[PDB]
Amino acid sequence: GQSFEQWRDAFRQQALAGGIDAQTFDRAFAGVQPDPAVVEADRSQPEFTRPVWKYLEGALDPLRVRQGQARLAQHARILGEVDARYAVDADAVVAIWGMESNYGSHMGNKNVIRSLATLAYEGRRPEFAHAQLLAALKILQHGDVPASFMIGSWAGAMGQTQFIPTTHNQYAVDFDGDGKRDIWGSPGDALASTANYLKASGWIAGQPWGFEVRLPAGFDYSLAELTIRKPLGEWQGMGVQGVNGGPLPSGLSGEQASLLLPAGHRGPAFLVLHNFRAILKYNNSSAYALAVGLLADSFKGGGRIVGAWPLEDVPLSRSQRIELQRQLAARGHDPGAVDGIIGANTRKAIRACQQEFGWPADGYPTPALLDRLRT
Ligand SMILES: CC(=O)N[C@@H]1[C@@H](O)[C@H](O)[C@@H](CO)O[C@H]1O
Ligand SMILES: [Ca+2]
Questions:
Q1: Is the CB–ligand 1 distance for residue 167 below 6 Å?
Q2: Which of 63, 149, 245, 248 is deepest in the core (most CB within 10 A)?
């Protein structure tokens, strides 16, 4: 509709047609108007880094590590039961909990119905918003939480787990048996829900998400690519070693792994395994998944990175990523659609350009590359 009131009246019809009761709808929308803060967040396609090392610094903050250790102790019984029942490592569940809501202290302060209605009414992704809004109304109808306490982020990610509504409906768990899947106020429900989602996403209990490695001299950096997987044994037969030298972890010889270079060839290198892919299902960002894995490791005194981070790591802004794609295309290295998103097609073009300049082909774009392109 044109007015918010008009849009809501029309959506109310769709909500009823989808099985939401009038009382649930009217209770959910009581007092609701568009939220400009949500509109701003939706619109803000940013202009600034990063870099991964500052992001990891915040994520691996000793304050967050110690708070997770405290939570592991406080909730040891529940976590033991969740770890055993879902076959998902407690440290990973708690690391996700820390990264998503700071173990429940930062769930956001926005009402999920207001936020999703705002996005449905005037957001850039109304298909997503409408779908999530109807799912959210189903959650209210089922009674998992009262409308007043259905809290989450601007994009509709909810509660301690930051599940979007359709993910809650599919994977949230009632751990304590009161009949509510309360990912807002019940640590047990939240933790079991997170575990259930990780397990559905392929988690193998006890298997590392990945680990730091040392690459051999004259390494083929075009292989550092998440879309390329190889057995650990094959990586070993390529000259990839443990971070201090010597063979890679034993027994895993047949495990498929990809090479992750979060700061290009001058930075630390990681082999990442299937459990890393599981974390990406939670949040499809390699920086996020690396932070979750290192945080999980940190609870037990791990998470130490041996390779130095490059001092000159200054990630490209939105503007620069678009400029990079245009300059690559102009030089004859086709990155595909100029969308300002560095994915596989752009990395392919970056690698060809790096090879043209005689640089290691790590597919990792830097201000130096952009300068050289402008010559
Ligand atoms: C924790 C969580 O809900 N993560 C979701 C994932 O469930 C959903 O499939 C994805 C689609 O791209 O959007 C993310 O927000
Ligand atoms: Ca419950």
A1: yes
A2: 248
